[model samples]
Target chain A: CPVNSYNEWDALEEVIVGSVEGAMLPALEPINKWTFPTGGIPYPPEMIAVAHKELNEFIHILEAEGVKVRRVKPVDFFASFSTPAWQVRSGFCAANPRDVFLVIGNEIIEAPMADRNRYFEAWAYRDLLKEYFQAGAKWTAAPKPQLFDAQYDFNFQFPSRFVVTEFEPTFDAADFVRCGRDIFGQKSHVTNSLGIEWLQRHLEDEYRIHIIESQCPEALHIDTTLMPLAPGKILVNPEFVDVNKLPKILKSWDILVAPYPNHIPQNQLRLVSEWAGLNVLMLDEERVIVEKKQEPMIKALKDWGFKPIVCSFESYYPFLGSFHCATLDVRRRGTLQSYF
Target chain B: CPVNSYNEWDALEEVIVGSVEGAMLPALEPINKWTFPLEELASAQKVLFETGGIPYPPEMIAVAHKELNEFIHILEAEGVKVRRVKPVDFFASFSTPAWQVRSGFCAANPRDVFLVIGNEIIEAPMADRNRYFEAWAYRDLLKEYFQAGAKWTAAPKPQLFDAQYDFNFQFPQTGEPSRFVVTEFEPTFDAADFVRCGRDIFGQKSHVTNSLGIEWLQRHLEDEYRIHIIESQCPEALHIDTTLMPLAPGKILVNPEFVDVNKLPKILKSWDILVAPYPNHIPQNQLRLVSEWAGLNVLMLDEERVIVEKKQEPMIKALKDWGFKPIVCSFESYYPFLGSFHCATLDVRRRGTLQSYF
Candidate 1:
């Protein structure tokens, strides 16, 4: 079977871990207006080294835990490329598997991202997708968005001062969180309404996508905001999503509020906030993979009935992703089912 | 209802006819090892295809423009809505990190770039650097199709590096047969290399199409479609339309001089195979990029109707004899650009359903 992942908290079998060996830091484009520094600068090699080291350890951990982790070979991300609309001297790296792929039951959909630097980013995963397709998985790609200047909104208001424009369908798979037949999405800097609509229409009778409004203007991915840990259990970041505004389907699920980070925020301002602490990976319904340094989060998780298997993941935070963003669950032990 | 197209002879609904406004005669590249320089290869010798590195004569462009307009006008007159790609200035020089070309090639043949099989519009990756960005010319029209719920697929782009060229494809000194100019480095093909007939999609490994490219298409459409790689004696011929024409259900028109009837495909063996009549030869001085047999590159309006070269009376008579109503038109001057009728148009929608015709 090419794909069989329905919910996040399933018995993990096979997964894909993105490589960051040749990962190039992106230039500060409008897509990172609020989260990243202006005048895009190359990241320090030392930081990249730390991130790679931590990722290597995580892979080992997953492999030792009996999970089949496949990795995409790194590309020369520093090489420059151009298209009709725009040109960039460098391309972004494929460090985040969750951003590029979305496996819903039996299909692996390539997400259409909203950065000029990421126009050819999908090429990194082409081989893997082809292999999956040949092995009986339905392979599909979102319409490539024309990432022209008009695709970005330079001047927009708060709450919805989104970095991306409605120029076309564009989004990262990380913008969506799955819970069986119900999938929740957020409109962020890399995702727009058209992107959501495209997925909705593509899913049709198979699944439903609900647009959830996030109060944080800098929130770029839904993984840090809300995650469905089990059939009726949800772990949510209290900062971004309001519990009172939960959707009708989600209102019935037990909401577990994530505690604030006990570890000091990294000195350097990075691509994401300290909220990455809430971005945990579910090993199963009862066991979660969390960061070792976040003691209070671990204690809260233990109190909330989840076995927190903490690992040394703090050094990788500057790369802008935690466990959830670094890995994409390709095959899980469960099939499609109604959670609510 | 995102993707649907089963057979070639179904009633044409919406089609894309390419624009020739900026057609450029590409400077001979490595890929054209045997096609250019008509006189140098009387013995079928394989020599590097060389080019004069200038735009095609303006008169040829003007004629092609006029002819394509007439073609589009005829299609519209027949209730088929025709869409045109935005013309690109192929005269401009460009470069990419992987490779660079002195000038761009024309978007005159939409069938070579865009393949609409079922509900998906596949943007085939080309082997030529000059045509690397060719699909961009059709993006505007493709965007409309995407909005209308069509699946838009841009196949993996091939890095047309030096390694992709078969430098040692020895051309027989006796003017005999040889291998193709392209190497199987990665998947690369022009959409025209494939011919569709419901569940059976026939492809050919030509100078522009490699075995890997065919494998890519076959695996991508494995469950929904079955791909068959067919054989042809016309080695230099790239597009399938110039050699094989499925005019109607279970009926085919094979090039008499190039195709052998006994070695025909198993699927077409039981069907009526009509040998196309000899095309009226063109003057040696006129553009002869393609043989006069291009007259056989017929476009089917439906199972009962087709369009052919107005000058090829014998072919028209034979077509009529086969119970197909022929709407002959003058388009020989346009042949030098790329191909004849079928090469110039990409049929997106046909009034038919998916069925096992084979």
Candidate 2:
């Protein structure tokens, strides 16, 4: 069972890096209607080439750091699929493995993603998951949600309102951030209360799921809002996350408020907020990955007694994720322990 | 937390009974090819090709529905709570990346799809392509169970590619060792391949259940339970329910044609093994998805009460002579659909706790 990751900041051993190859613009659905209003077109080849180059460089950096890197098999996301309840014209890309798989302890759980277009996104990782399962990892998939009309609230508003209803537990893996025995999750357009409940019950008493509060109306992944760097240390985007609303245990830890992004938009479409600059990946407790253009964040990491590994990833922002979203840490060389 | 059955034959409480509505004959694929002779397979394929989907005769379905209703009434009369799966259009075509199926299978055998042990219900990754989406029929019930605190788990879905099956394999003769149609390309199984007996569960490698599937179950259950693989004589075996059935703690009913009682596991050797007599009064010239031995797939109401098909008079007499109450019902119509009392129902709640019965 090589998949023994429990938290985000442990020393990396193995990882699954997402690819920009075959990346297609998902059709606008209730789950992504707000973020991707005009998303029925394919991404430009030049943009994909740049993103792919950056991703490969990142993978090489990870390998240089002695981490075993794995990539998902590219699939044609433009193909249409239909279920008994509904149908979708196209699927999102395999550019974000973290959005689909959650690695807890030695088990890799496939989330029942909310968007109809992303229903079959897990197809890209089937071979990888099978390999992990054959190697003795306890692989499981949450009950596949039938993303029908009832699963969403078409008249969805902002902050107080969510598109996903409590219709059979839907969530993206990126909505959750693990810390040893404690895990933090939030309800957003892609994640509902039932999804959090299902994960809590599935994990049982061995893990505690604390529902963190957020003020971002278009919040999807928690990585941009709340990023835990190391034990007793975390990075927060003050605009979306209020320090006072976090769990009491987290209040005692040192909070590093992330600076606003200063990099101008390079892509035609911006799917994520400037907060994606805070969606950095931790290589270990001391080393972290940050966007090359985000100078303030690099300075903030150095000031916090951490080394920053700079990389250009703004091209991936249009696809709705960056460093943390593009990779799934399969094995971190650390045992499960409560930092608090 | 309603789901709490650890093994078979506890004081019966609540159960999930299968439905015959929207029932369709599954397309002849590699998994079912061995069950049908070459001539019958061609005939069935022709019907499926012409009709788009193969459905059983409406007359047979109507009769089976009547018998199922009667069976449910009998269960209610015995003070047991019965739940039914919602009927879906099994004729709907669905496919994954690996393969495609002309139509889906029905919810006529809940026992074959779900394995409820203790308070958890595990959805088996069935081997047949037609049965891939069969779990959709029970989604509502599963949600209800999960909402009530039942531990619901779905095994990793298997990519049933062409490599997972040996299309060229032929059924072995009587003297040869059993060979299965399913290969170990991935974990594939039907819940019926395993029979539970408290802490020790018995399973077999059959046409639909491979060794990896058994290993997956054992590893998933971990130290909480032990799984034993039993060897049976049937070369074309599809499920262990028809070969070996644990009726109670220390008593088991086995099909004599398939199982040699002396060859059972050492732990099972100490238990009372009741060899079922040859089935009599079987309906002739009927479309049977299973063998005549399906008459032995009786449901146990408890240690003392057993439900037997009215046509299986020999089984009824044997049970009565063994000092057990036999509740008779007309479920022979369901036999053609590949199930009987035990196969058609999933025992969700039996009045007992987990304990080592062996």
Candidate 3:
């Protein structure tokens, strides 16, 4: 099977980076409270162009590092779609393939996304997935979620209540951060207990899934909260994760608390928290990709005995995520062994 | 786990029987030509082209519902637990970006949509556009099963683009190898196309099931089970249950018109094969989604008993003469919808473990 990746920090061989070609603001719904008032509109062409340029430069950097890069097909996000339950005015873009596809070992699982606009987001990667499957990759899709009115809580309160109900198993691949044999996931607005359970059962006894509760009230993905850089090393957002509450296996590892973002433009950051600066992608065990603007994070990585490869990606943050969010490492040259 | 079934002839415990509510004759398309005769295809196409969809008469639906209820009663009387899926509005039109359908197919055949093997239930990616969302009718039940610790898997849904079908390819008219309407665009199959034994499963490439679909099942099952492709002679083959039925250990029932018993796989050389007599119960000029061999599609209650259609008296006599008890039930109304006793039900819990009978 061409698709084989057990951990995040293995030598990256092949990856799928998302595209912002037809990026559109998703329709206003309870699941989109973070960027609600700005829904049902496309990002300005100028902004999209800049983000596209930044993503291409990142892709070039990956290629220069001797890694293979793939891009998802952009779709017409302005088109409306209807299911038996409800209708959405517009669709979400293929700008974040990490949010839809989870590649483990020889299989790629299409997640059942929580948002209505992102219902058919997996369609963008159909061609690539078929190619991989034809090459002996086991492609499987999670049960599709019916995001009816009952799936959302209109009067959602932070910290205790989530916008998405435990209707049917719903998740985004971004909610999980894989280690060699231990994968850490969190219950966020997009990932519920049922979704986590589904993934746990699907993986069977081959892997162990540990649930980490984040302190962030509006947490969506786990990448910005807790990230596994390599074996026995992890980076965590100080504001979101409590080290004491994590799984016991992490007690043997070095927990590096990320520094606050330097001079982050709050007005421009609509889709994600400032902590997305810590959501860096690892080229190998020692080489880490960091945002050029996050000087403190770059210095912190160097201080922690890691090589920081600086790149500009803040322009793409408004679209939802950063380096790790935009890319899914399909082939990390590593063996399946317990890191802990 | 609430879901546990190894093969067909195990002592039955729980099952899911489909409902005929909101049944609609699917829109005429290339895939429907093989199942319907040329004249009936043209007539059905005329009605479909004019009305967007051909809905079954309410009277027919009511009769099917009653018959299905009676079937359920018979199973319950035999100490079997029966479950019914929630009926969806199949009349509602739905589509993907590649294609569209005027109306969805009904939830009249749970066996076609779900494959229950041991502790897992796989939702098959059906070929037709009208059956794309057929899984919605059983979502709640699937969730319940998942919550009870059963492995629930949905095969990769195909895009079903125009290229997926061989529209220009003609069906074989003479002694030629089998060809299918569905191309290898992606893995598309109706679950009924595969007949499961303990560690051995037999599948066929038919109009609704392609080779890739069989390959997907093989890879998904991994090293624990082996899948074999059966070369049956039915040109319009849709499901394998009508062509091959596993009754008990070292015993099998097959349709003489489609299956050549001598040519079966070497693994089944020691098993006894029972060829079904020609069906004498089919009504004249009635709509049928399957051939008259559907009378051979019986549900095995256990090693000693089987569920045969009440009208299929010939099949009943054969089962009796073969040293098996036949439990008869009325199911002729479901034949038009392309299923009979075995097709209408999915055996969720059969009291047996994984073992090789051979």
Candidate 4:
């Protein structure tokens, strides 16, 4: 049986399965043929099939070796090279594949098309209960295989440059979730982007959401919550709003954990250019994967009572990934601690 | 002339034509059994033709949808149920099912197994591709029309993940580019996981690689770097990586942009993923369809970058993609950075493009 959460699954033997029976692979929208210059043919199904064939035979050789094989059951020689554009329109998805990072099988859902297209995503959530009962899927520490469609889109060309609103994303039914929040917001409809993430760590079974009235304008996720810190102490992110609905959630028996956004560099404009974008600081034990100039954040971690290990990755601050995107710590030794 | 990217194609006002073909799907090692659940059924050549590679990879489906409609109607008639598939179902939902979460394709692969799950494995419509997608997805326009499953596992597995990586420098910037690196021994990332990815691919002698590019989009013809070298193995962990989308499942897309294609033959020579090189990439989806008629080796890498499947679709390999850094070619002429073939030829906004490669 699958474990209930990341915590439950992290014990004794860690046998990773191979068949896709319980796997998911995320995809991106394909660029135009122009970007591919001499490539991009596989996006078309036929070519993808060709690629799949070539790849299958390679599996045979693997069988001959020592590795275990999860015969991609319907093993065709063709590759599944469909583009993300093709996927969203199809409307709906089954499982997720982030088993590596997240605990396991936590399903997340993206917004739909209706309200800024965010409404469309809501459709899938309606059937969430049916899926669990019908498919026998369960929720883990991680969000269920979640969907992440956008309420806002940005264009590269003239009038459609980098802003939300005119940004309409295609919606899929396969990926759905539930959250009674308004799916879209103004032109830059990324409200849910942070909202969904906030709930990931906060909500505990059935707890009340309080309002310390200190939410960041654009924080993707918050480690804030009245969570149990080391042994006797309880650590909470010094931020909240609206503790109205329920009273069960514990708000007082706690210690305050300070966030290290200081590494973000606010006072100086010309300087933070190097290590300013300190998204998340993941500890690789003795060594850490720190965004080049996020040294102060490391200092913050040290000052907060936890051991700080640092590794340098300067390129992350630029376009794609950084300490946040680069590292994924799976089976760390002990209990996970909140930032204090 | 196809536009260089998806948006460009969306801006057109014309009609498009495409070609179709057929291929068979194969069974993988350890017998994932999702398709051919029965033993007697598994051995039948009639039920299982050699689309080329193992049945698990996503590319085989692309071949079916774009290149052949043998199973297209099957999906429309049947519909898919993918909540179980970790890669396709989960990832789409977690990351960007926003546009259109499914892909489209018809791959007449090596089995009756397709009938098992039309929604996921057998058939899908083009609506998936035409409707929703993202700026970075690396999938082929699966359907001219809907889109896209797999199960597997082999103990002492087969060699299917064929990638070749050599420490070479196509550019002076990123240092030595690992050109065309496949599933050999390298402690990079989840090397063991990658070894598993390569399990089903290295056994064959040749492959029919279905490939093509948008006309105007392919640019003044050649010279870029992202073209050519295709297919690699990915470890599921860091790939789906934990954290952000943990339970969210897998919502990442193609990162072929990170692959170094020029290193294949040398790296994957011994692995099983290797089959006879016949013909196929950009048109990879279509190639799977037609490869059946010609009986070629095929292999395809899904947009997810983690799942690599086959349908006797290998027409080409041994070269490198022209997009990452086609230094030899001038940027003014190259077209690899565009949206791709399947998604390009249409002006969903305007209807369609005029000069279809098919």
Model number with the top DockQ: 3
Q: Which prediction has more favorable DockQ, 1 or 3?
A: 3
Q: What is the TM-score of chain B in candidate 2?
A: 0.95
lDDT of 4 by residue, A1-340 (tens): 2212222111211111112111122222321111110111213334234324433442343333322322212222112223322223222111111111222223222222222212122222223322332333222111111123332342433231222222222222111111111111111112232332333322333322232222332222222222222332333334332334212333333343534444442221121122233333222222222333556556754665545434443322221123333222222233322221
Residue A325 accuracy (lDDT) in model 4: 32
CA lDDT, candidate 2, residue B106: 85
Model 3, B48: alpha-carbon shift in Å? 4.3
| Fraction of the reference Cα-Cα interface contacts (below 8 Å) that each candidate reproduces | 0.15, 0.43, 0.45, 0.02
What candidate 2 gets wrong by more than 4 Å, as runs, is A36-41, B37-52
**What's the TM for chain B in candidate 3?**
0.96
TM-score of chain A of each: 0.95, 0.96, 0.96, 0.35
Worst lDDT run of 10 residues, candidate 3 chain A, spans A31-40
Docking band of candidate 3 = medium
lDDT of 2 by residue, A96-214 (tens): 89999999999899898888778778888888887887898988878878776888888876646678888788889999999999998898888998888889998986899888887
- Choose the strongest candidate by lDDT: 3
What shift in Å separates residue A290 of candidate 4 from its native position after superposition?
Answer: 8.0
DockQ of every predicted complex: 0.27, 0.59, 0.62, 0.01
Q: How close is candidate 4 to the true structure, as a TM-score?
A: 0.28
* CA-based DockQ, model 2: 0.59
Between candidates 2 and 4, the TM-score winner: 2
Residue B11 displacement in candidate 1 (angstroms): 2.1
